[PDB]
Amino acid sequence: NQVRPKLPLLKILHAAGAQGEMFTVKEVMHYLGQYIMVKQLYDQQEQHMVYCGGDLLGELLGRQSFSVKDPSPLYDMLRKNLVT
């Protein structure tokens, strides 16, 4: 019913307005999208493109950028940072 994000990810979620430490999958996804939207990490022209270099999100993902259209790297980071 819920997962616990490891610290690095929990800080990012909190910065997007998340409260607590236990969340559902969709909850994690919601705050993560709000983090990206708020900090405007996506490109204005190609909005599926997210540049995270120089942001803690990029340090956690192990990448300077990713595409929401090919989420594999995103899901790989979540499997490594979410505990059931």
């Binding site: 969709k26 996804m29 999208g33 939207m37």
Partner: peptide, 12 residues
Amino acid sequence: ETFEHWWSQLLS
């Protein structure tokens, strides 16, 4: 599409 459109449909 917009960022919201793409993101809201991850895992769908």
